[PDB]
Design a protein around this ligand. Structure first.
Ligand SMILES: O=c1ccn([C@@H]2O[C@H](COP(=O)(O)O)[C@@H](O)[C@H]2O)c(=O)[nH]1
Length: 218
């Protein structure tokens, strides 16, 4: 069939649309990181804020794991109840800001390594009511190995292929840990610039509902 996996799946997130200045800042930051990757013969991080023809692509804050409901109608009803419960909050908007240094997250099959920065403490705190609403409605049997919560809220800014994906797991983990050290020690000088400028106020959430993306106003 068509989309047999994604038909019952929902996922909640914040959409971060970069203005022209934020785009230029991320161009500059990632160019400096990738110069360091070149120097050290590592894979480069593809910038996540630009697509084909340099078209701007929004970044995101994931707010839920991949949620697999019993059928498509249950997915749509639960997403609608999340939409209403989020509207019912006093929240007119949620702020997004980052703090700390570079983090590198591996995806579920270790093929991709995401260069990211964690959300600042007040930004994570403002999302706790939203995260509670998600926890109330998510399916009890998870299909993701990585749950999404206050402890790992982040924005990813670039993504590299794991060159050691098909090597021994110990070799790949050693290369990932030295990569984490490498970007932190050698490619951190523009993080104050990134943290000062990659700040957002979101007036709505987004959800992937099956194959579609819908908007949940605050
Ligand atoms: O604590 C975490 C949180 C997320 N991820 C992974 O980081 C990737 C980037 O997620 P995101 O930036 O799209 O939210 C995803 O593959 C996710 O599974 C982790 O490895 N650990």
């Amino acid at each position: 069939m068509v989309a047999p996996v994604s038909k019952n799946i929902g996922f909640l997130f914040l959409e971060l649309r970069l203005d022209s200045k934020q785009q230029q800042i991320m161009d500059l930051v990632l160019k400096g990181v990738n110069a360091v990757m070149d120097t050290h013969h590592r894979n480069s991080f593809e910038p996540l804020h630009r697509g084909k023809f340099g078209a701007m692509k929004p970044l995101h804050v994931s707010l839920s794991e991949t949620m697999m409901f019993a059928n498509e109608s249950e997915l749509e009803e639960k997403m609608g109840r999340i939409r209403q419960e989020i509207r019912a909050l006093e929240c007119k908007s949620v702020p997004v800001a980052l703090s700390g240094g570079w983090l590198v997250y591996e995806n579920f099959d270790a093929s991709l390594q995401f260069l990211a920065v964690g959300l600042s403490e007040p930004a994570r705190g403002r999302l706790k009511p939203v995260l509670s609403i998600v926890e109330k409605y998510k399916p009890r049997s998870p299909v993701s190995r990585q749950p999404v919560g206050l402890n790992n809220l982040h924005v990813s800014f670039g993504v590299a292929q794991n060159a050691y994906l098909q090597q021994d797991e110990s070799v790949s983990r050693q290369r990932l840990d030295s990569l984490r050290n490498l970007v932190a020690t050698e490619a951190s000088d523009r993080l104050p610039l990134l943290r000062a400028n990659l700040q957002f106020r979101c007036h709505e959430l987004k959800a992937k509902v099956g194959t579609s993306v819908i908007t949940l106003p605050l």
